[PDB]
Design a protein around this nucleic acid. Structure first.
Ligand SMILES: [Mg+2]
Ligand SMILES: [Mg+2]
Ligand SMILES: [Mg+2]
Ligand SMILES: [Mg+2]
Ligand SMILES: [Mg+2]
Ligand SMILES: [Mg+2]
Ligand SMILES: [Mg+2]
Ligand SMILES: [Mg+2]
Ligand SMILES: [Mg+2]
Ligand SMILES: [Mg+2]
Ligand SMILES: [Mg+2]
Ligand SMILES: [Mg+2]
Lengths: 190, 199, 345, 138
RNA sequence: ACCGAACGCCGGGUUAAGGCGCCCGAUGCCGACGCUCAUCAGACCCCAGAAAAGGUGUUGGUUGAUAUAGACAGCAGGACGGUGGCCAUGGAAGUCGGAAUCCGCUAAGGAGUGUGUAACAACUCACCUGCCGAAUCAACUAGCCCUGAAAAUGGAUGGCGCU
RNA sequence: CGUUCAUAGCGACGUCGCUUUUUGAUCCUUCGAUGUCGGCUCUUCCUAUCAUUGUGAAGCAGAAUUCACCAAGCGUUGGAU
RNA sequence: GCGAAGCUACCAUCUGUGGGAUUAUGACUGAACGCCUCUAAGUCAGAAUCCCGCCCAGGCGGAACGAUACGGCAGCGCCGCGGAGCCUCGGUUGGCCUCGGAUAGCCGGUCCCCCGCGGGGUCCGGUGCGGAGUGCCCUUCGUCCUGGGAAACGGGGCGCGGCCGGAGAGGCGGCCGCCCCCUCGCCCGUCACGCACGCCGUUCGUGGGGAACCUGGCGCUAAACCAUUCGUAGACGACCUGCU
């Protein structure tokens, strides 16, 4: 039934400054801005506290599937804050039993050529979502590093190269190859 | 003597219903910015529903068979045509009053245009419900001129923004003017608020 | 019941009302998309199908069995004497479509061109564009002209030049020169228009439009064949010898119960003189016409670097049912639509 | 981003119904969509009333959630809600709208004559202001 | 052929059975309370169409739990010995099967849920903690919705449409 | 059953359905006549998908494969009796 | 026998294209359910599918432009302003415009900052069952006379010339010179206008739309069809051509 009220709080840290034009949070700090719109979620994004310390999200007269959004908005702002402060660092290790998936970034991070996958002549070119920047790591041999602020864009770009390197018309239990996400960490930990 | 209705923010059949009866009572109506009409129910839902209508054709000679109009104006016309007795003389006469446009062209681009709040999306739908823009719909089913209609409307909105700024400028001067004059309009301005305006 | 043994259906529905084309001169149904970036140019030309012949050439597709092997090859000669620009005509985008906006015609216009505007020239007093050309020599007119061009600069998007043929220079009977709108594809519309305003009343030859080893689309009307039966017009099976009411027919038009004969069923009607746009016809040779420095230069046509004789593409006794190709011509690979003498876009 | 609330003690103007055009305090909330309501000073008997019909003011007079009518009568008369309401811009443009409805035919004529003139005076003064603004621009 | 009602020719009134977005006379009520979103929604006697069986889809019930002796999940630590227990040898020391089926240590572990073994091994599946911080969880039941749900000219809640 | 393992693939004893490309029932229509089989020829639809595109499954190492999904765009032939 | 032209054959030769939305599916972020989940709000990839493109036809659908009957009787195109006279009717103040939002908006003003008198920002001050309100605004609806007050340079002569803005189906405005005339809105006095004797279609848009008729000024000077011809065409029509 209609729950008379639900809410939550999102305690912003003193480094970051968040601001909300209505229902369109914009979060800025060390690394950069991250806007996100929630016109489509239907909530009261109050912002309270001197020093602007916490973001509150009411949701009045919600039914079960309307009250399910409350936390997911709150959480999306949490990631947004993390992105601004620390920034996300997805690491993905290449795997093969023969053909050593030859990776090479191109423009800056943007492009990812993925040559010699399974001994295929086809060279996979994979763009990155605006903001994300791939880079071939050191201190680990067959391993990529995708860094960026907007987690959504990062993890999508990770998937983009994960599904790029897919095996068709074979026993995938046998043929375990491709560039898989190994670790979802941050650019700096504190 | 003529309705002009901005079809933006309305509901396709909901507006068409109201337009039909106006049109049958001899009211000449114009319906403008028809691409902006929006239809309840999630997008995909309505695309299929249209695509079905496309499938309907007179097997032996499609050239005769139900003419599936793409343009949002003609779509909206089609749905209003479905609520009149359009095989009659009086029905055909009724449609001849109605005048529909994709976007908002030159007679009516400098006319104030009404809004049927009984067909309006913000009112008639729950906010958590989904709907479709009849533009998108029209576009994907083969409407040629979305982008053109967009490029012409950006001009119009820029052209209009100017008009509003000048309008505002007069309003402001008029607010100043009254204050400049309010001892030599004082025993007029008093009488216009005994009988209850200006308050 | 189902038809027993399957078979793909005869003829394409993507081509029908198999009727006699309204036009004779094949329309360009779409010009290419003018990227605004590359410089201005014409997108089309109007030639004439003079005749076929061989070529011989070394081929260079490595891998093929025919790599570095001299093949022969058929070719069409399209005699293409230079066109004369006599107009421009501005268009504007609308949600309705692409409205023609303003047509500015040149000053002087040939009787080659003027012919076109009368159904009977012998009987006319030849009074066309007479009060028009008054505009081109006064203050009032020239100013209005400039304002028209300015308006086109403000408003228009697509610009097509109007040119026409030089019917004068051909072996054909007709004098009535074909006009045609040709689209100027290039930079910004103001640049685009001042190019066509410079070209006005001027010749334009073939080499200015096309270059060698270039795929081009031939547009024309097909060689017409009158009323033809279903066996000719659809390539339906003949029925056998014993058939009592004839055998160049279709037996079952249709089923009973969509109780109408469908548009997909094969019937006898007009075969030929259809409009058709065959694509990808590679230009092997853009050939220079006869010219004079002291004597004739007839050589410059059908001589090759390896042949070195004194030929023209004209064969002995000319191209049959045509003439001498005394003008510049293109030389496409393969056959193209239409008859000898046919105007060809 | 809400400013007015179904609070106990909120004064609400009834938009329509039997008690249309009357103020009324929210004593207790019964349901999702029904408020137990009272308007002792404003001639409205203690009764349940749906929210759909009441539109709520910017006046929260303070009493306890199910007092016995006497006490809300005090909290109404202490705050002097009738005086404060009639002072509001809202209530003025209610009063206005009623006086426009009461207008008699001679009264309608007077008005027209008064406006006919009053809009002429302003119109000139606006035109003068435009000329002065044009003179500044020059 | 159903329901209502049974006809001289007309005016006013009122009804029935049916309705009242527009087609089409009437809700253009500030109607009341819920339920339900369907990439096959649903939409009224006769009637022109679906079942068994499913679904943490959502909404109600019913019955039982549980938990401050601070749980419940979520991660982390052990899973033994009397004992190749007995029948079965073809090998079953917990483990193709079946009769059994208790004690010790116990904080506590079934003569064993499975994985897998020729058979073990090795792994895996209570009782209890450490962190976190209020409800948690099970089994039925019935409403709408969905799966179940395949036909041949293009098509029919009557149509347009409707959230 | 499938070494082992109910459900990869299967599936007894039972059970619930759809279909009208089988055959029956039935006799409503037509007996002042609706030309009675097959083949040829031609068009179009359906999908209950043989192949082809995109995919999930395996008792799929590869090759070969069956099981299922979207799906009827395009095909589905030459002969002997 | 051989055979030109012409038809003609996988029996010769040539050409056959690009996007979008997404389905099945596999994924992201992510609640519901302190974990987990492709899903609930949100996001990605995605196809012989579907829709378009190209390609064929082209609407009781439009377009720009040309020429528009010298004449031997002609007949018309504009412009302005007049008289009658059939016919077809509907009407009976106007509204000359921001964009949009809806778990928000509207207006100001910026002291201050950035951009091209404006635009964007912040900050502050007002409104918000919207009075800078379509529950709205504008406009007045008897005629004249004279003789005061408040308001007062406003209006006109289908007054006249220049400079603009407007192309989506522009069809409308605006702003600037010069000539002549008037004193119009709001109150008061002051009289008079057929006062047609209680009684219906009054009152306007209206110089309306169309057809036929009398005046001035400035312009005009035909094509089409047949016949004939041609063969890129053809059953016949039609079509492509030619003809001081
Ligand atoms: Mg394989
Ligand atoms: Mg078949
Ligand atoms: Mg015979
Ligand atoms: Mg077994
Ligand atoms: Mg039978
Ligand atoms: Mg028969
Ligand atoms: Mg299927
Ligand atoms: Mg999905
Ligand atoms: Mg996508
Ligand atoms: Mg795609
Ligand atoms: Mg089409
Ligand atoms: Mg009248």
């Amino acid at each position: 039934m209609k729950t008379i009220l639900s809410n939550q709080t999102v305690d912003i840290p003193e480094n970051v400054d968040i601001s909300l034009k209505g229902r369109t949070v914009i979060v800025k700090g060390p690394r950069g801005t991250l806007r996100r719109d929630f016109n489509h979620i239907n909530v009261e994004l109050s912002l309270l506290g001197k020093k602007k310390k916490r973001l509150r999200v009411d949701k009045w007269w919600g039914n079960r599937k309307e009250l399910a959004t409350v936390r997911t908005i709150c959480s999306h702002v949490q990631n947004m804050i993390k992105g601004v402060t620390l920034g996300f660092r997805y690491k993905m290790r290449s795997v093969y039993a023969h053909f050593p998936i030859n990776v090479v970034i191109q423009e800056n991070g943007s492009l990812v050529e993925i040559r010699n996958f399974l001994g295929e002549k086809y060279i996979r070119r994979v763009r990155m979502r605006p903001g994300v920047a791939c880079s071939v790591s050191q201190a680990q041999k067959d391993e990529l590093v995708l860094e960026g602020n907007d987690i959504e864009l990062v993890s999508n770009s990770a998937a983009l190269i994960q599904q790029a390197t897919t095996v068709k018309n074979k026993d995938i239990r046998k043929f375990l190859d491709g560039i898989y996400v190994s670790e979802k960490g941050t650019v700096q930990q504190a | 003597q003529v309705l002009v209705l901005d079809g933006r923010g309305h509901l396709l059949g909901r507006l068409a219903a109201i337009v039909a009866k106006q049109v049958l009572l001899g009211r000449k109506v114009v319906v403008v910015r028809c691409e902006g009409i929006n239809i309840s129910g999630n997008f995909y839902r309505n695309k299929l529903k249209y695509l079905a209508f496309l499938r309907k054709r007179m097997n032996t000679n499609p050239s005769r068979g139900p003419y599936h109009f793409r343009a949002p104006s003609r779509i909206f016309w089609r749905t209003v045509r479905g609520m009149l007795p359009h095989k009659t003389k009086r029905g055909q006469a009724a449609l001849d009053r109605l005048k529909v446009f994709d976007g908002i062209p030159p007679p009516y681009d400098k006319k104030k245009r009404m809004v049927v709040p009984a067909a309006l999306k913000v009112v008639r739908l729950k906010p958590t419900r989904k709907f479709a823009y009849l533009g998108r719909l029209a576009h994907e089913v083969g409407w040629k001129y979305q982008a053109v209609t967009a490029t012409l409307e950006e001009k119009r909105k820029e052209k209009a923004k100017i008009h509003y700024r000048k309008k505002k400028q007069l309003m402001r001067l008029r607010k100043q003017a009254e204050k400049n004059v309010e001892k030599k309009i004082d025993r007029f301005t008093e009488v216009l608020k005994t009988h209850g305006f200006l308050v | 019941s189902h038809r027993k043994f399957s078979a793909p259906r005869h003829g394409s529905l993507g081509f029908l009302p198999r009727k006699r084309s309204s036009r004779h001169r094949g329309k360009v149904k779409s010009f290419p998309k003018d990227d605004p970036s590359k410089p201005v140019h014409l997108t089309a030309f109007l030639g004439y199908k003079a005749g076929m012949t061989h070529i011989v050439r070394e081929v260079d597709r490595p891998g093929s069995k025919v790599n570095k092997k001299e093949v022969v090859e058929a070719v069409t000669i399209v005699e293409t004497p230079p066109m004369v620009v006599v107009g421009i005509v501005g268009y504007v985008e609308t949600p309705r479509g692409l409205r023609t906006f303003k047509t500015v015609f040149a000053e002087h216009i040939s009787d080659e061109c003027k012919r076109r505007f009368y159904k009977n020239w012998h009987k006319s007093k030849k009074k066309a564009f007479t009060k028009y050309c008054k505009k081109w020599q006064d203050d009032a007119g020239k100013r209005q002209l400039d304002k028209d061009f300015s308006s086109m600069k403000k408003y228009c998007q697509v610009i097509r030049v109007l040119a026409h043929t030089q019917m004068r220079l051909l072996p054909l009977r007709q004098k009535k020169a074909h006009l045609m709108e040709i689209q100027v594809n290039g930079g910004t519309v103001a640049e685009k228009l001042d190019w066509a305003r410079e070209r006005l009343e001027q010749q334009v030859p073939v080499s200015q439009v096309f270059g060698q080893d270039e795929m081009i689309d031939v547009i024309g009307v097909t060689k017409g064949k009158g009323y033809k039966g279903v066996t000719s017009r659809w390539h339906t099976k003949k029925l056998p010898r014993k058939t009592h009411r004839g055998l160049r027919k279709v037996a079952c038009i249709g089923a009973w119960h969509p109780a109408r004969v469908a548009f997909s069923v094969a019937r006898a009607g007009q075969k030929g003189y259809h409009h058709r746009t065959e694509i990808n016809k590679k230009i092997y040779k853009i050939g220079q016409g006869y010219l004079i420095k002291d004597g004739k230069l007839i050589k410059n046509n059908a001589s090759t670097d390896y042949d070195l004789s004194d030929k023209s593409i004209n064969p002995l006794g000319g191209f049959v049912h045509y003439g001498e190709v005394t003008n510049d011509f293109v030389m496409l690979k393969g056959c193209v639509v239409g008859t000898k003498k046919r105007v060809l876009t | 981003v809400f400013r007015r609330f179904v609070e106990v003690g909120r004064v609400a103007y009834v938009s329509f119904g039997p008690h249309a055009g009357k103020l009324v305090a929210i004593v207790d909330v019964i349901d999702q969509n029904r408020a137990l309501v009272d308007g002792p000073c404003t001639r409205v008997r203690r009764q349940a009333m749906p929210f759909k019909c009441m539109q709520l003011t910017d006046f929260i007079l303070k009493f306890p959630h199910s007092a016995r009518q006497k006490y809300v009568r005090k909290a109404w008369e202490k705050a002097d809600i009738n005086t404060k309401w009639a002072a509001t811009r809202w209530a003025k443009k209610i009063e206005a709208r009623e006086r426009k409805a009461k207008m008699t035919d001679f009264d309608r004529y007077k008005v027209m004559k008064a406006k006919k003139m009053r809009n002429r005076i302003i119109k000139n003064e606006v035109k003068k202001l435009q000329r002065a603004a044009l003179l500044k621009a020059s």
